[PDB]
Amino acid sequence: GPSVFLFPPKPKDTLMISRTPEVTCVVVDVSHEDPEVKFNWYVDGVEVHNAKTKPREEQYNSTYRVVSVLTVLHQDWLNGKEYKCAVSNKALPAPIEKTISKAKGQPREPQVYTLPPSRDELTKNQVSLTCLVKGFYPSDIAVEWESNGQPENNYKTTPPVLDSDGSFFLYSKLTVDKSRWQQGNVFSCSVMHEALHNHYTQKSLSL
Amino acid sequence: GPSVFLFPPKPKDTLMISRTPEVTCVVVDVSHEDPEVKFNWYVDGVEVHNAKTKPREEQYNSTVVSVLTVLHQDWLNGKEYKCAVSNKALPAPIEKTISKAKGQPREPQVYTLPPSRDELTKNQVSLTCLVKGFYPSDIAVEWESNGQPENNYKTTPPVLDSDGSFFLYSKLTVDKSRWQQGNVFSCSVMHEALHNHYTQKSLSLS
Ligand SMILES: *[C@@H]1O[C@H](CO[C@@H]2O[C@@H](C)[C@@H](O)[C@@H](O)[C@@H]2O)[C@@H](O[C@@H]2O[C@H](CO)[C@@H](O[C@@H]3O[C@H](CO[C@H]4O[C@H](CO)[C@@H](O)[C@H](O)[C@@H]4O[C@@H]4O[C@H](CO)[C@@H](O)[C@H](O)[C@H]4NC(C)=O)[C@@H](O)[C@H](O[C@H]4O[C@H](CO)[C@@H](O)[C@H](O)[C@@H]4O)[C@@H]3O)[C@H](O)[C@H]2NC(C)=O)[C@H](O)[C@H]1NC(C)=O
Ligand SMILES: *[C@@H]1O[C@H](CO)[C@@H](O[C@@H]2O[C@H](CO)[C@@H](O[C@@H]3O[C@H](CO[C@H]4O[C@H](CO)[C@@H](O)[C@H](O)[C@@H]4O[C@@H]4O[C@H](CO)[C@@H](O)[C@H](O)[C@H]4NC(C)=O)[C@@H](O)[C@H](O[C@H]4O[C@H](CO)[C@@H](O)[C@H](O)[C@@H]4O)[C@@H]3O)[C@H](O)[C@H]2NC(C)=O)[C@H](O)[C@H]1NC(C)=O
Known part of the structure; x- marks a missing residue:
């Protein structure tokens, strides 16, 4: 049937x-x-x-x-x-x-933290920029990367993971040529979630 | 049926x-x-x-x-x-x-990342373990301190990266006081492409 x-x-x-x-x-x-x-x-x-x-x-x-x-x-x-x-x-x-x-439950505001690459990774041709988004509910969320107004395409974002306190977290990894991070360029992690003001926040990351 | x-x-x-x-x-x-x-x-x-x-x-x-x-x-x-x-x-x-998934096994690269300086105004801080470039996706990740296991951690599923390898993150949550004191925390990774199927990367306040 x-x-x-x-x-x-x-x-x-x-x-x-x-x-x-x-x-x-x-x-x-x-x-x-x-x-x-x-x-x-x-x-x-x-x-x-x-x-x-x-x-x-x-x-x-x-x-x-x-x-x-x-x-x-x-x-x-x-x-x-x-x-x-x-x-x-x-x-x-x-x-x-x-x-x-929509998932039932009290919505919670995502906390967005940008983490630079470990110094071990600098011996590579490319480095990994990390965006940690934790403490958000419900799990519906969007994450994007950009630099100087234009989008960065070489990034991947984990699925939302249920944390121990009932909220969710995820990580987003942006991969850039090591030459761009060394120059001092600024990169931005964009997050959209219902519990954010204007449903949007932005956290930047640079050396 | x-x-x-x-x-x-x-x-x-x-x-x-x-x-x-x-x-x-x-x-x-x-x-x-x-x-x-x-x-x-x-x-x-x-x-x-x-x-x-x-x-x-x-x-x-x-x-x-x-x-x-x-x-x-x-x-x-x-x-x-x-x-x-x-x-x-x-x-x-x-x-x-x-x-088992077919293909040349690849060695995980393991990086421990300290908490963002923004997060220090919290009661607890997040210790991060990045594991990338590994294949196949079968893997185990653990955290420990002074030889004993840490239990308050969560690990993302493996995610297919753009080059055909996989990555994940593991997040260990500790009381901000333990991180401030200078305790050493270690991210353990088990994977077939590692020597002895095991590597360990430490993380402490610098
Ligand atoms: C006759 O053929 C039908 C279609 O045939 C096509 O031709 C063949 C040759 C293949 O190439 C097919 O891939 C092709 O589609 C078959 O239809 C399918 O039936 C199965 C059920 O047996 C459906 O499976 C369900 O899929 C859900 C996910 O579906 C989204 O993603 C699919 C890709 O993974 C995509 O193909 C779908 O179109 C759909 O796309 C989303 O569409 C919406 C709206 O259109 C968009 O808003 C989204 O953005 C789209 N998303 C993406 C990523 O593009 C699953 O979620 C679902 O699983 C759930 O239910 C099961 C229980 O049933 C749970 O166990 C599970 O945990 C989960 O909760 C399920 O797998 C499939 O979607 C149908 N395909 C289409 C196109 O509709 C017929 O089966 C076949 N008949 C026979 C008798 O053989
Ligand atoms: C009456 O209730 C029962 C529940 O009590 C129903 O049983 C359920 O039947 C469905 C099929 O109709 C099964 O669905 C499949 O699940 C597979 C995954 O199974 C693992 O993970 C689930 C948790 O999500 C867990 O409940 C299962 O027990 C199983 O656990 C794994 O177990 C092994 C060894 O025991 C262990 O080593 C693993 O660690 C463990 N894993 C985890 C995470 O715990 C899926 O793989 C199946 O999906 C496949 O097929 C799809 C096409 O059909 C395809 O699209 C997918 O991509 C995928 O290839 C499938 O979804 C339920 O698991 C099963 N539940 C239990 C508890 O057994 C019963 O059907 C129901 N009957 C009626 C009439 O109502």
């Missing part, structure tokens, strides 16, 4: 008013015998109908994949409203419902 | 001869109606019989594990371990295979 997957908006979308956060209800494994699928959307149990269903797309394994997108208000998501996607299909014993919401 | 999941040994078990590494074959959704389950194990296609099936836990939803000890060097050399599960309530037996 069919399967349903419900995806939340990206952390960055809910935190910046310029962007459009969306919850996405994906239905896979819809057979040819019964291709009609209907979506009912609910916000805290109140049915809404402003969703946008996309017309079914046959996949290469002879099954139809139907996607429905519901735009959400930034403050609705941040205020913790529940979003329920009810999927009905005549080849189902009963409709399938999935619910998604 | 039932499903089968096959798990590798713990990184630490394969790297220390004193420990016993094991691959674990978990069968879930075994019904009351048909409870009989069987296991056949193979090492690179050669059937072995030293496996040991351990019984047996009924679940919170009305719904069997088999363990096979392996030689440390067999796993590290990349031999295949096959768990064939037979059940009369299956259309045909389910077989799953697992092995």
Whole structure:
């Protein structure tokens, strides 16, 4: 029978008013015998109908994949409203419902600390700049690097890790040519999180 | 019908001869109606019989594990371990295979980073251990001080870096008073590409 997957908006979308956060209800494994699928959307149990269903797309394994997108208000998501996607299909014993919401719990402000490279790493051609983000809740967060206004692309960020006190932490590693760090260039770690002022903070790092 | 999941040994078990590494074959959704389950194990296609099936836990939803000890060097050399599960309530037996990640093992680079000077206005400080450039991702990280283990630490999962190697960070949290006194803390890393599968990097107030 069919399967349903419900995806939340990206952390960055809910935190910046310029962007459009969306919850996405994906239905896979819809057979040819019964291709009609209907979506009912609910916000805290109140049915809404402003969703946008996309017309079914046959996949290469002879099954139809139907996607429905519901735009959400930034403050609705941040205020913790529940979003329920009810999927009905005549080849189902009963409709399938999935619910998604922001993690429950008191939000906490990320602490952002930039750490320079260990002196051991200076014998390398490239050095690792570290951004420690700890003590934040919920785990939805975005981390970026930049220098002199332009983005740095050669960086990787760990997934959020549950800390011992119930908050989350992560590390972000920016890799630059050792020549740039030695010159004295300034690098900045950008963090977006709901518990930040303007949902944004910036911590710089230089020799 | 039932499903089968096959798990590798713990990184630490394969790297220390004193420990016993094991691959674990978990069968879930075994019904009351048909409870009989069987296991056949193979090492690179050669059937072995030293496996040991351990019984047996009924679940919170009305719904069997088999363990096979392996030689440390067999796993590290990349031999295949096959768990064939037979059940009369299956259309045909389910077989799953697992092995160590393939590729040239690479040596972890281990760097200890002191706390940011901003963090000293806190009751506790964060000691950081960067482990990068290692392959495969199987690894164990521990912290200690004066020979004894530190327990209040967390380690990120391995993250695939841009060059195909992995990195992680480990964060040890200590009372700011211990760091200020000058105590020495050590980040221990176990990995197959290290000499003696082990390296240690210290960190203290400078
Ligand atoms: C018929 O074919 C379908 C699609 O076929 C395609 O063609 C084949 C040849 C392959 O190339 C496929 O890769 C390709 O898609 C199959 O569909 C899939 O079904 C499976 C279920 O069996 C679905 O798995 C679920 O995936 C979730 C994650 O999905 C995101 O990421 C996927 C990449 O990893 C991506 O492919 C998806 O499209 C989806 O992308 C996100 O989409 C949303 C909205 O569109 C965006 O907002 C996000 O930004 C996207 N993210 C990214 C990173 O791009 C998993 O989370 C999920 O797991 C969860 O549930 C299980 C329980 O079911 C838990 O155990 C688990 O812990 C977790 O909680 C699950 O794995 C898969 O997504 C489907 N593919 C698509 C494209 O929808 C059919 O299975 C197949 N039918 C048969 C009978 O073979
Ligand atoms: C009734 O309730 C049961 C729970 O009590 C349900 O059992 C569950 O069944 C699902 C399958 O439907 C299993 O899901 C898989 O989990 C694998 C990971 O398993 C390990 O980690 C989980 C913690 O997340 C842990 O609960 C498991 O017990 C298992 O632990 C590992 O165990 C080994 C040896 O015992 C140990 O050495 C490891 O250290 C240990 N690891 C950890 C972290 O503890 C995933 O790998 C599976 O995913 C794969 O397959 C996906 C496709 O299906 C694919 O997309 C993925 O990428 C991946 O390849 C899968 O998610 C649950 O583990 C299992 N729970 C338990 C407790 O056994 C039962 O299904 C349910 N039945 C009904 C009818 O309701």
